[PDB]
Design an enzyme around this catalytic site. Sequence first.
Site, PDB file in Angstrom:
ATOM      1  N   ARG A  79       0.671  -1.204   0.083  1.00  0.00           N
ATOM      2  CA  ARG A  79       0.081   0.090  -0.050  1.00  0.00           C
ATOM      3  C   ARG A  79       0.864   1.271   0.181  1.00  0.00           C
ATOM      4  O   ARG A  79       0.381   2.266   0.563  1.00  0.00           O
ATOM      5  CB  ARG A  79      -0.882  -0.037   1.157  1.00  0.00           C
ATOM      6  N   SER A  99       7.019  -7.305   3.369  1.00  0.00           N
ATOM      7  CA  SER A  99       5.808  -7.711   2.715  1.00  0.00           C
ATOM      8  C   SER A  99       5.949  -7.936   1.183  1.00  0.00           C
ATOM      9  O   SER A  99       6.760  -8.674   0.550  1.00  0.00           O
ATOM     10  CB  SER A  99       4.811  -6.559   3.097  1.00  0.00           C
ATOM     11  N   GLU A 106       1.055 -13.300   8.436  1.00  0.00           N
ATOM     12  CA  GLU A 106       2.310 -13.593   8.733  1.00  0.00           C
ATOM     13  C   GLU A 106       2.400 -15.109   8.859  1.00  0.00           C
ATOM     14  O   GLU A 106       3.265 -15.750   8.527  1.00  0.00           O
ATOM     15  CB  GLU A 106       2.368 -13.180  10.089  1.00  0.00           C
ATOM     16  N   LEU A 158       0.548 -17.377   7.113  1.00  0.00           N
ATOM     17  CA  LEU A 158       0.489 -17.753   5.898  1.00  0.00           C
ATOM     18  C   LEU A 158       1.861 -17.932   5.249  1.00  0.00           C
ATOM     19  O   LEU A 158       2.460 -18.727   4.709  1.00  0.00           O
ATOM     20  CB  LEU A 158      -0.569 -17.067   5.137  1.00  0.00           C
ATOM     21  N   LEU A 194       4.797 -17.426   6.515  1.00  0.00           N
ATOM     22  CA  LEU A 194       5.761 -18.331   7.242  1.00  0.00           C
ATOM     23  C   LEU A 194       5.979 -19.482   6.664  1.00  0.00           C
ATOM     24  O   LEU A 194       7.242 -20.124   6.507  1.00  0.00           O
ATOM     25  CB  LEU A 194       5.323 -18.411   8.711  1.00  0.00           C
ATOM     26  N   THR A 211      10.428 -22.871   3.902  1.00  0.00           N
ATOM     27  CA  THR A 211      10.604 -23.716   2.590  1.00  0.00           C
ATOM     28  C   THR A 211      11.983 -22.833   2.161  1.00  0.00           C
ATOM     29  O   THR A 211      12.769 -23.667   1.511  1.00  0.00           O
ATOM     30  CB  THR A 211       9.556 -23.858   1.666  1.00  0.00           C
ATOM     31  N   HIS A 234       1.983  -9.455  10.516  1.00  0.00           N
ATOM     32  CA  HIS A 234       2.432  -8.532   9.487  1.00  0.00           C
ATOM     33  C   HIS A 234       2.037  -7.125   9.735  1.00  0.00           C
ATOM     34  O   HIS A 234       1.255  -6.561   9.047  1.00  0.00           O
ATOM     35  CB  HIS A 234       1.482  -9.177   8.453  1.00  0.00           C
ATOM     36  N   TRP A 246       4.145  -3.071  10.888  1.00  0.00           N
ATOM     37  CA  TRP A 246       5.433  -2.361  11.222  1.00  0.00           C
ATOM     38  C   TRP A 246       6.228  -2.338  12.284  1.00  0.00           C
ATOM     39  O   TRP A 246       7.335  -2.171  12.308  1.00  0.00           O
ATOM     40  CB  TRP A 246       4.678  -0.827  10.807  1.00  0.00           C
TER      41      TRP A 246
END
Length: 277
Positions: A36, A119, A223, A225, A227, A232, A255, A257
């Site tokens: 954003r 992000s 966060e 998701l 991770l 991996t 997720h 600041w």
Amino acid sequence: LPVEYLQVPSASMGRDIKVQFQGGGPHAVYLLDGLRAQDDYNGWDINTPAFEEYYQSGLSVIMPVGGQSSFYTDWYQPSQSNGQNYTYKWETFLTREMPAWLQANKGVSPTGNAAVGLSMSGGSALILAAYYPQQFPYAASLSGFLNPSEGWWPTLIGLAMNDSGGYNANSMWGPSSDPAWKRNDPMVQIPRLVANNTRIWVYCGNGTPSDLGGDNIPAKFLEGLTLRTNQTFRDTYAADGGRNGVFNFPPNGTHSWPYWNEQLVAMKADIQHVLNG
């Protein structure tokens, strides 16, 4: 704080790119914004004491402004959806136009810098180091999406981009079958990061908020998701011979600041020794 607001012309984009700048050394930390990104101030300056934290660090701090849903990449064409009247060419801006401008006028070195993204731009910073190792011997990814071409990611990225300003993922990297999706996939580019021996700093929280805040459903969900992808990435990195990375996967962080700032402060000493010491 001696922070400056510069107007850096982008010949490839046909417009001027606002850039927030703080000097302090020939080498700099490029602080990339999130999905954003606003047109008035870079997200790091709005939500964190970044400039203050790096004041007198022996490093210059560069904060480009703008680029909402751009992924800081060179798009194939204008976003066919929101009437964008020009083509984003942020990779070209970050690797040619801006460094040239900063070297001539400020004396900032075009080589030996650090690209720090979060992000949306976490993976972007890694890709920059992958293809421009001389410019970026150091790269940090904070809560990034490191396997954009795999499974549902292209679709999730498309919805996110459309949700944030109505941008079209297809205008950017083309159909999911297009080479751009893999060319800009950090996971896929791990061999380059290893070969170039890039110093990488990869972070990702687990979805559980700490005293730092960021306690809302969306931030916790994101966060947790991403991770999975970050773990991996670490594995594949090590399996591919990677030996110059820092992987911070604490049992906290959302997720947001506050966490990204905490990582920016934590990596300062690391950047100082790699770029200067």
